[PDB]
Amino acid sequence: GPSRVRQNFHPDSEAAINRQINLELYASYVYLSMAYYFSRDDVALNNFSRYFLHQSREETEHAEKLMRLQNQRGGRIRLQDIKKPEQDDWESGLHAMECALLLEKNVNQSLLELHALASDKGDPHLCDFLETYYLNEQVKSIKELGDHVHNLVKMGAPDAGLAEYLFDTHTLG
Amino acid sequence: GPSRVRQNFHPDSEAAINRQINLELYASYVYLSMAYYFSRDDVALNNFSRYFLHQSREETEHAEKLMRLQNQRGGRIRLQDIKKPEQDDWESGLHAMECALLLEKNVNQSLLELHALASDKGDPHLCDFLETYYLNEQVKSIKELGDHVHNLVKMGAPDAGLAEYLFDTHTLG
Amino acid sequence: GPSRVRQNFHPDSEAAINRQINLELYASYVYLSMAYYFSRDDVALNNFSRYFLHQSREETEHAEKLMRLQNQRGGRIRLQDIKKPEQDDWESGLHAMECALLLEKNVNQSLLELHALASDKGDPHLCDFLETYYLNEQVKSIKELGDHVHNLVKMGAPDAGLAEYLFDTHTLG
Amino acid sequence: GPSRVRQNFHPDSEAAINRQINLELYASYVYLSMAYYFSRDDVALNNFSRYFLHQSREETEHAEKLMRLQNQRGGRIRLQDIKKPEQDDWESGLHAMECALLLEKNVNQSLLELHALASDKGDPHLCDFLETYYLNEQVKSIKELGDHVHNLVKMGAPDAGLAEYLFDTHTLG
Amino acid sequence: GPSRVRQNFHPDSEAAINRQINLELYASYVYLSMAYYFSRDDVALNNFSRYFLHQSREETEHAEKLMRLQNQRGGRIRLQDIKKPEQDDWESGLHAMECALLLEKNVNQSLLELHALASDKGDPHLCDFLETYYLNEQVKSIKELGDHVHNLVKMGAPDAGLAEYLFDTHTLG
Amino acid sequence: GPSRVRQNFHPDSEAAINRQINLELYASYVYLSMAYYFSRDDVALNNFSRYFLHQSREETEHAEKLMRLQNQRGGRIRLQDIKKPEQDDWESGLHAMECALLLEKNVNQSLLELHALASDKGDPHLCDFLETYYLNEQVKSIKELGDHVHNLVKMGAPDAGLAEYLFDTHTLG
Ligand SMILES: [Cl-]
Ligand SMILES: [Cl-]
Ligand SMILES: [Cl-]
Ligand SMILES: [Cl-]
Ligand SMILES: [Cl-]
Ligand SMILES: [Cl-]
Ligand SMILES: [Cl-]
Ligand SMILES: [Cl-]
Ligand SMILES: [Cl-]
Ligand SMILES: [Cl-]
Ligand SMILES: [Cl-]
Ligand SMILES: [Cl-]
Ligand SMILES: [Cl-]
Ligand SMILES: [Cl-]
Ligand SMILES: [Cl-]
Ligand SMILES: [Cl-]
Ligand SMILES: [Cl-]
Ligand SMILES: [Cl-]
Ligand SMILES: [Cl-]
Ligand SMILES: [Cl-]
Ligand SMILES: [Cl-]
Ligand SMILES: [Cl-]
Ligand SMILES: [Cl-]
Ligand SMILES: [Cl-]
Ligand SMILES: [Cl-]
Ligand SMILES: [Cl-]
Ligand SMILES: [Cl-]
Ligand SMILES: [Cl-]
Ligand SMILES: [Cl-]
Ligand SMILES: [Cl-]
Ligand SMILES: [Cl-]
Ligand SMILES: [Cl-]
Ligand SMILES: [Cl-]
Ligand SMILES: [Cl-]
Ligand SMILES: [Cl-]
Ligand SMILES: [Cl-]
Ligand SMILES: [Cl-]
Ligand SMILES: [Cl-]
Ligand SMILES: [Cl-]
Ligand SMILES: [Cl-]
Ligand SMILES: [Cl-]
Ligand SMILES: [Cl-]
Ligand SMILES: [Cl-]
Ligand SMILES: [Cl-]
Ligand SMILES: [Cl-]
Ligand SMILES: [Cl-]
Ligand SMILES: [Cl-]
Ligand SMILES: [Cl-]
Ligand SMILES: [Cl-]
Ligand SMILES: [Cl-]
Ligand SMILES: [Cl-]
Ligand SMILES: [Cl-]
Ligand SMILES: [Cl-]
Ligand SMILES: [Cl-]
Ligand SMILES: [Cl-]
Ligand SMILES: [Cl-]
Ligand SMILES: [Cl-]
Ligand SMILES: [Cl-]
Ligand SMILES: [Cl-]
Ligand SMILES: [Cl-]
Ligand SMILES: [Cl-]
Ligand SMILES: [Cl-]
Ligand SMILES: [Cl-]
Ligand SMILES: [Cl-]
Ligand SMILES: [Cl-]
Ligand SMILES: [Cl-]
Ligand SMILES: [Fe+2]
Ligand SMILES: [Fe+2]
Ligand SMILES: [Fe+2]
Ligand SMILES: [Fe+2]
Ligand SMILES: [Fe+2]
Ligand SMILES: [Fe+2]
Ligand SMILES: [Fe+2]
Ligand SMILES: [Fe+2]
Ligand SMILES: [Fe+2]
Ligand SMILES: [Fe+2]
Ligand SMILES: [Fe+2]
Ligand SMILES: [Fe+2]
Ligand SMILES: [Fe+2]
Ligand SMILES: [Fe+2]
Ligand SMILES: [Fe+2]
Ligand SMILES: [Fe+2]
Ligand SMILES: [Fe+2]
Ligand SMILES: [Fe+2]
Ligand SMILES: [Fe+2]
Ligand SMILES: [Fe+2]
Ligand SMILES: [Fe+2]
Ligand SMILES: [Fe+2]
Ligand SMILES: [Fe+2]
Ligand SMILES: [Fe+2]
Ligand SMILES: [Fe+2]
Ligand SMILES: [Fe+2]
Ligand SMILES: [Fe+2]
Ligand SMILES: [Fe+2]
Ligand SMILES: [Mg+2]
Ligand SMILES: [Mg+2]
Ligand SMILES: [Mg+2]
Ligand SMILES: [Mg+2]
Ligand SMILES: [Mg+2]
Ligand SMILES: [Mg+2]
Ligand SMILES: [Mg+2]
Ligand SMILES: [Mg+2]
Ligand SMILES: [Mg+2]
Ligand SMILES: [Mg+2]
Ligand SMILES: [Mg+2]
Ligand SMILES: [Mg+2]
Ligand SMILES: [Mg+2]
Ligand SMILES: [Mg+2]
Ligand SMILES: [Mg+2]
Ligand SMILES: [Mg+2]
Ligand SMILES: [Mg+2]
Ligand SMILES: [Mg+2]
Ligand SMILES: [Mg+2]
Ligand SMILES: [Mg+2]
Ligand SMILES: [Mg+2]
Ligand SMILES: [Mg+2]
Ligand SMILES: [Mg+2]
Ligand SMILES: [Mg+2]
Ligand SMILES: [Mg+2]
Ligand SMILES: [Mg+2]
Ligand SMILES: [Mg+2]
Ligand SMILES: [Mg+2]
Ligand SMILES: [Mg+2]
Ligand SMILES: [Mg+2]
Ligand SMILES: [Mg+2]
Ligand SMILES: [Mg+2]
Ligand SMILES: [Mg+2]
Ligand SMILES: [Mg+2]
Ligand SMILES: [Mg+2]
Ligand SMILES: [Mg+2]
């Protein structure tokens, strides 16, 4: 139009928000895949399943809050295909946790690049939005996954027969 | 393996369930797109938005129950890309309702084909699963959307200035 | 003195905060004027009246929080005349909403300039204050007013006899 | 028009009500200024601050009830600039109380002149409105401020170091 | 390692966080010293004591939240000696309040330097952490202490026999 | 002065109480260090962390009760630097427990020496104070830590992958 609401909102920021929406939906899909891997009859770690299903739902919330931001600022949402996750078989509780940690660091790098763009475009509203709802959530998620990876490694996962079972019961229960 | 749980579960049924999972996730994504279209500053039909967001969440439930079925029967979930919806701009409340009706009939045709396959493979568990959780839900959804389309058409949508506003307040409120 | 509390608080920031206090009080006065326009016997849109009276009270809160900030940082409040609003007769519900939208964008531009000044003066406390209490409130207000303008335009306001009446009852009720 | 509601409402009364609205808003602004003076780091009399903030809010109520009267009688509200208060620095608790007392007597004189005009124009509704909501409130406010001035003078304000502190705690607490 | 969690976290920021932890613990110790000065038999200002004990506990919280941040970001906490406070005898309620005000401004300068470093290193997570939990808390603490100093000075502390006693009862009670 | 409260309170006892205050604060700091070691991403034993944070807070209470005693008896508190703990990296749950046990025995030896001094100076109030609040608390703490060390040793800590994890969940949970 521009939109009668649009103010101080650079087209590059609008485009970067659309790419972030897609990445959050991708993260949601990765976690959904992991959740149902852990409910296979030959895996059957029900608290790993619950943990990743919860993470999946949180990532859909992350996507939705960026879709809301786009509308609030007068941008136009442009959805793209949600790519399937990299693996069909997540191999073990430890491997899934390590893949989740890498995913969260990759999404964090994307958010830091978006914050740098918002700063370059003099968009303090977008900077604050990312700082308030994304950057600390990402740090907390990365730390939690790092904690989980460390315990599973120390316990002897994936080959130590009791490790993932006990972690499933005692940490994720 | 086969899976130590697998019994009377044809590979074609397993593959058809994976395709249905993808279609339900696609339907979820279409509805998510519609929900955020209706919260644009130049659309602002908040109960259309709420209605389609609810439909989106129900379709993710539909996908998840098929993912659970795959695991229960000892099949292996194989996820694929979730294609973006056909439209970025859903044009009007009436157009979105008509597109939703067509989507629901297309998903119903897929479910009827899956039921015919399950029947051909002598899989009464899969037949009952579809009849119990999918086929009546689809008939109810198609009827509700048809009701909504009829009222919006009769009221003069999309060009009659009061029609979508009043429908948003009085039916979807 | 300087004030025994003052630290990292530039005189230009102090002056810009005094100008912002005046602008928030002006916005409060505009909304008060609009509120009582809608309770005229020849307008009588009581929910438009309530809506703008609420917006008036929120703007006085906005002014007061900046007056508090000035004292917290050791600046000195310098009040100026609160100019009367631009119009005595706001013409219609749609016209008042469009004028409110323009007011909110003008106040937002002032807040963005204040944030740029605070950034230039290395005042992260003032930057955070604006981001936490002003910039997202402004984006939400601009979006809400844009939504309202769109519905009133589509409904045929101001000339369509039912439009402002129905909007008053169903959105602002 | 005249307004289809207007009856026995002289144009001079309508104009005098508009001037009274402005004076009540001015009184509100004076009290707001005083409230934030008392929360300066070098004044810090928090119950003086609370007292004057309350008086400020009451004066805005006084303005609003006259704006309502104008609409009820079919007059047209005509707002004017709200002049800034006379002082930026209110010097002491005693000085602020003495200035408030003078303000209230000046506003009372304006209300008595308005009542005399209403009487001259044979407007018993306007006479009763002023008697019911303004004249006794003004007498009570003037008496309360006189009480406060007397105690502060007797206690040795502003130079007696304990006087304003103790009055703030024990009377305004 | 680096830590499998570490991302966008500069070694200089890690070191500056360790120095800030020490400074917050120092502030805690200063306040603890002041608290027990006020419970001496020859001072016996129990609400000054309570006030400073509370401030001591808040500073330990400030230290702990930075220790948590270090772990969240994958830095390594490096503790140093907590230096004893500057004075054994805090002389008076007024002198302790003035020393606390200077301490809070010195800690604020350290936090502003840390924020400038975080900005220089492109660490928006660390910038937001400081803005969210430290910079406004510091401004509020400095303002409260300035208020307290002003009242005690005006009341005639420390030599006016009633001043600190009355302030202890009426402000800090 | 002496203090108008001082009675039967030897200067050597006063000095020994000041040294004990410092030692209790040191113990508090050791435990604080241990608490945050266990929340590292590469340790992540959250109940070890909670356990040592609680012990840290108890030691600050121990310091404060001696500071209160000094004031009650008319002595003068003389604070000294709180030395940093001996280790930055506590190596394992078992090593931290063994270091805590040694710390508690060293603090107990200090308390026994203080009791012997109080006895030598004919100070039954100080003897009773130590017996009532310190000596049994120390015996209980040493016994609890010995219990914890024994279980961790028997379970195969630190090298047995499940030992510290299971102890964290089942004893410290
Ligand atoms: Cl723009
Ligand atoms: Cl994309
Ligand atoms: Cl794509
Ligand atoms: Cl590709
Ligand atoms: Cl970007
Ligand atoms: Cl950045
Ligand atoms: Cl910016
Ligand atoms: Cl966050
Ligand atoms: Cl963990
Ligand atoms: Cl590890
Ligand atoms: Cl094992
Ligand atoms: Cl089979
Ligand atoms: Cl597919
Ligand atoms: Cl595909
Ligand atoms: Cl294609
Ligand atoms: Cl099929
Ligand atoms: Cl069939
Ligand atoms: Cl069958
Ligand atoms: Cl069904
Ligand atoms: Cl319908
Ligand atoms: Cl029809
Ligand atoms: Cl119509
Ligand atoms: Cl300054
Ligand atoms: Cl101004
Ligand atoms: Cl002016
Ligand atoms: Cl002018
Ligand atoms: Cl500016
Ligand atoms: Cl800026
Ligand atoms: Cl800055
Ligand atoms: Cl905000
Ligand atoms: Cl609306
Ligand atoms: Cl429009
Ligand atoms: Cl109409
Ligand atoms: Cl008339
Ligand atoms: Cl006037
Ligand atoms: Cl004027
Ligand atoms: Cl003038
Ligand atoms: Cl008059
Ligand atoms: Cl009269
Ligand atoms: Cl009369
Ligand atoms: Cl009255
Ligand atoms: Cl009085
Ligand atoms: Cl008098
Ligand atoms: Cl006095
Ligand atoms: Cl890094
Ligand atoms: Cl240090
Ligand atoms: Cl040192
Ligand atoms: Cl030194
Ligand atoms: Cl620094
Ligand atoms: Cl900075
Ligand atoms: Cl940055
Ligand atoms: Cl803060
Ligand atoms: Cl104070
Ligand atoms: Cl002063
Ligand atoms: Cl005195
Ligand atoms: Cl003695
Ligand atoms: Cl010592
Ligand atoms: Cl030392
Ligand atoms: Cl040494
Ligand atoms: Cl000893
Ligand atoms: Cl002994
Ligand atoms: Cl004895
Ligand atoms: Cl004991
Ligand atoms: Cl044990
Ligand atoms: Cl043993
Ligand atoms: Cl083991
Ligand atoms: Fe999460
Ligand atoms: Fe959650
Ligand atoms: Fe996310
Ligand atoms: Fe995430
Ligand atoms: Fe267990
Ligand atoms: Fe539905
Ligand atoms: Fe539902
Ligand atoms: Fe479905
Ligand atoms: Fe459906
Ligand atoms: Fe609002
Ligand atoms: Fe509100
Ligand atoms: Fe505002
Ligand atoms: Fe506003
Ligand atoms: Fe910032
Ligand atoms: Fe009053
Ligand atoms: Fe009142
Ligand atoms: Fe008044
Ligand atoms: Fe008044
Ligand atoms: Fe009193
Ligand atoms: Fe505090
Ligand atoms: Fe507190
Ligand atoms: Fe602090
Ligand atoms: Fe502080
Ligand atoms: Fe922020
Ligand atoms: Fe203990
Ligand atoms: Fe305890
Ligand atoms: Fe102890
Ligand atoms: Fe101990
Ligand atoms: Mg564009
Ligand atoms: Mg992408
Ligand atoms: Mg499950
Ligand atoms: Mg592909
Ligand atoms: Mg495996
Ligand atoms: Mg936050
Ligand atoms: Mg196969
Ligand atoms: Mg398909
Ligand atoms: Mg909505
Ligand atoms: Mg395509
Ligand atoms: Mg259209
Ligand atoms: Mg049924
Ligand atoms: Mg100046
Ligand atoms: Mg201005
Ligand atoms: Mg009304
Ligand atoms: Mg003018
Ligand atoms: Mg008109
Ligand atoms: Mg916010
Ligand atoms: Mg006229
Ligand atoms: Mg006047
Ligand atoms: Mg106050
Ligand atoms: Mg003037
Ligand atoms: Mg003065
Ligand atoms: Mg009366
Ligand atoms: Mg290093
Ligand atoms: Mg230092
Ligand atoms: Mg006490
Ligand atoms: Mg020294
Ligand atoms: Mg002294
Ligand atoms: Mg804040
Ligand atoms: Mg001596
Ligand atoms: Mg020692
Ligand atoms: Mg913890
Ligand atoms: Mg040393
Ligand atoms: Mg080790
Ligand atoms: Mg006992």
Swiss-Prot record, chains A, B, C, D, E, F:
It catalyses: 4 Fe(2+) + O2 + 4 H(+) = 4 Fe(3+) + 2 H2O. Residues 7-156 form the Ferritin-like diiron domain. One of its GO terms (molecular function) is ferric iron binding. Its main location: mitochondrion. It comes from the Eukaryota. Fe cation 2 binds at E59, E104, Q138. One of its GO terms (biological process) is protein maturation. Detected in testis and erythroleukemia. Expression is very low or not detectable in brain, colon, heart, kidney, liver, lung, muscle, placental, spleen and small intestine. Its EC number is 1.16.3.1. It is an enzyme of class 1 (oxidoreductase). It is found in: Mitochondrion. Belongs to the ferritin family. Catalyzes the oxidation of ferrous iron(II) to ferric iron(III) and stores iron in a soluble, non-toxic, readily available form. Important for iron homeostasis. Iron is taken up in the ferrous form and deposited as ferric hydroxides after oxidation. This is Ferritin, mitochondrial. It comes from Homo sapiens (Human). The lineage of its organism: Eukaryota, Metazoa, Chordata, Craniata, Vertebrata.
